[PDB]
């Protein structure tokens, strides 16, 4: 055949892949964690968005730390040979490097490690996307007026907020990040490369949202998502 390029991930496998959505809204009373009002809006938006991208979506609600680990272990042990990629969305409370099960924390590394290039062979060389809507600390942004491959390769972590910062969620409209992500995927998934779509998400969250609170400490705050890429190729959700 003619000249061939290897700049983009092969996304024309029989299946796009799984999209696991872990939606934690209600937490065990003993944890002292608040109910995440508006998260169901996020979960539904994500389910529809990824369904239209042809992903096999599996929604899971209110999972304990043990259930989260079991689920990810089981999913990583499935045969992903006929799948182009893997997507996991985590909606919960969190801290830097941590996501909360309904009864306690789970290190994000524990979850992502199941999908390492050496631990999930049927996903080796394929994009593994982790979308995380959770806090990464307690900082508030005041804003300003205007052969072998690495086992950590091929992962993309789309964090809702910058390292060390809180992440915002509206009880009626859903989280700022997920609202924006779904809107940009619906509008550009058939036109732009993934990093460019995520950059549009960054701009949307950065410019269209600002917190409103009766508490001065939490009022008029801003947010910027954080794209962390270990991808080795361009990612387009469409093919041909």
């Amino acid at each position: 055949s003619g000249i061939s390029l290897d700049n983009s991930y092969k996304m024309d496998y029989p299946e796009m892949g799984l999209c696991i959505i872990i939606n934690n809204k209600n937490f065990h009373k003993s944890t002292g964690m608040t109910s995440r009002s508006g998260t169901d809006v996020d979960a539904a938006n994500l389910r529809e968005t990824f369904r239209n991208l042809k992903y096999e979506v599996r929604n899971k609600n209110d999972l304990t730390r043990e259930e989260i680990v079991e689920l990810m272990r089981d999913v990583s042990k499935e045969d992903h040979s006929k799948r182009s990629s893997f997507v996991c969305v985590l909606l919960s409370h969190g801290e830097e490097g941590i996501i909360f099960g309904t009864n306690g924390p789970v290190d994000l590394k524990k979850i992502t490690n199941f999908f390492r290039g050496d631990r999930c062979r049927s996903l080796t060389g394929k994009p593994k996307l982790f979308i995380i809507q959770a806090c990464r600390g307690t900082e508030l942004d005041c804003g300003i007026a205007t052969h072998k491959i690495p086992v950590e390769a091929d992962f993309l972590y789309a964090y809702s907020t910058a390292p060390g910062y809180y992440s915002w969620r509206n009880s009626k409209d859903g989280s700022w990040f997920i609202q924006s992500l779904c809107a940009m995927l619906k509008q550009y998934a058939d036109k732009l490369e993934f990093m460019h779509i995520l950059t549009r998400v960054n701009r949307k969250v950065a410019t269209e949202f600002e917190s409103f609170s009766f508490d001065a400490t939490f009022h008029a705050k801003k947010q910027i998502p954080c794209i962390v890429s270990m991808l080795t190729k361009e990612l387009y959700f469409y093919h041909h």
């Binding site: 995440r36 809507q133 992440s167 915002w168």
Partner: peptide
């Protein structure tokens, strides 16, 4: 708005 609320924080996570």
């Amino acid at each position: 708005d609320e924080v996570d």
